[PDB]
């Protein structure tokens, strides 16, 4: 599944007849379903928020142009 299934799904994708766009939309959806099957996104989200808020109120949080630059560049490029 989390390997065997993906390889099989990619195989169906790269084989396109069978009417591409239609079939592929489903195959692509299945690939997406496999990649986000065990999703429990928030790992330390709640703690990170608290730690950050507590640090901002304690006046212990540095806002630098470097970090903002790293943020934007990493996100867009």
């Amino acid at each position: 599944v989390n390997r065997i299934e993906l390889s099989r799904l990619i195989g169906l994708l790269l084989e396109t007849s069978g009417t591409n766009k239609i079939e592929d939309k489903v195959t692509l959806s299945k690939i997406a379903q496999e990649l986000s099957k065990n999703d429990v996104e928030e790992k330390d989200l709640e703690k990170k928020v608290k730690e950050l808020k507590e640090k901002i109120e304690k006046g212990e949080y540095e806002v630098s142009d470097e970090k903002v630059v790293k943020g934007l560049i990493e996100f867009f490029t």
Binding site: R3, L6, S7, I10, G11, L13, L14, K25, L28, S29, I31, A32, Q33, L35, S36, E41, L45, K48, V49, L52, K53, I56, V63, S64, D65, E66, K67, V68, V69, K70, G71, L72, I73, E74, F75, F76, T77
Partner: protein, 235 residues
């Protein structure tokens, strides 16, 4: 040295397979700025098409460079699809105006910043409807800013493959410094919101809890900051 067809086929699949986690990571990160209604499977879908195309049009033998290129095409394919949507529509821009007005009207009327429940009330909609609208508005500014960053990428992704590591570092430094110039011209409040959102990778809802304000407030600050950056980098 020539290569057999079965081999080419397998190398390709392994390469696709190898980067699928990257498509997930990128879609998830972009999802933090999208209205809840946008299906991550759509993002991943387009992201995979982008991945396959990048793998095929690949010839660079500097792995880290192959990856940076793969990453770039994935984001590109996802933004290509999101931009084909109604994010920059007039109806969205109109709602943004109405919301700003409502917010400002409540600010004076209450002497304080309104809550999201209060903003949605003066508008005659649910808070879920409001959160969606603020997400579409904010995403429009993300798209516009992406157009700028893509203009840069469209140029340097044509140079780096035939450039040396030292030259690549120079090209990258010119980009970081150009962004650093624009960032420096942001108000303390906006800069702080931008850092929590992009450097800390926190959705607006989480930023609202940290700054002890409303989502509507964090959203206007994000939109304003994003608008500034676009004009700054465009000039």
């Amino acid at each position: 040295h020539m290569k057999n067809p079965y081999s080419n086929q397998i190398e390709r699949e392994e390469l696709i397979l190898k980067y699928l986690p990257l498509v997930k990571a990128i879609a998830t990160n972009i999802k933090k700025h999208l209205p809840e209604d946008v299906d991550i499977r759509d993002l991943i879908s387009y992201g995979v098409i982008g991945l396959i195309k990048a793998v095929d049009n690949l010839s660079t033998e500097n792995p880290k460079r192959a990856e940076a290129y793969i990453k770039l095409r994935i984001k590109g394919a996802i933004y290509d699809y999101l931009r084909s949507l109604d994010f920059g529509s007039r109806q969205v821009r109109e709602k943004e105006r109405r919301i700003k007005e409502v917010v400002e009207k409540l600010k004076e009327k209450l002497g304080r910043e309104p809550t999201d429940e209060e903003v949605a009330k003066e508008l005659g909609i649910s808070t879920e409807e409001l959160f969606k609208t603020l997400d579409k508005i904010n995403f429009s500014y993300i798209l516009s800013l992406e157009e700028v960053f893509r203009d840069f990428a469209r140029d340097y992704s044509e140079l780096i493959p035939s450039s040396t590591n030292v030259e690549e570092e120079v090209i990258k430094r010119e980009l970081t410094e150009k962004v650093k110039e624009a960032v420096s011209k942001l108000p303390e409040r906006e800069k702080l919101v931008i850092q929590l959102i992009f450097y800390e990778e926190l959705p607006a809802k989480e930023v609202a809890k940290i700054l002890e304000t409303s989502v509507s407030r964090v959203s206007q600050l994000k939109a304003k900051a994003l608008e500034r950056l676009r004009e700054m980098l465009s000039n």
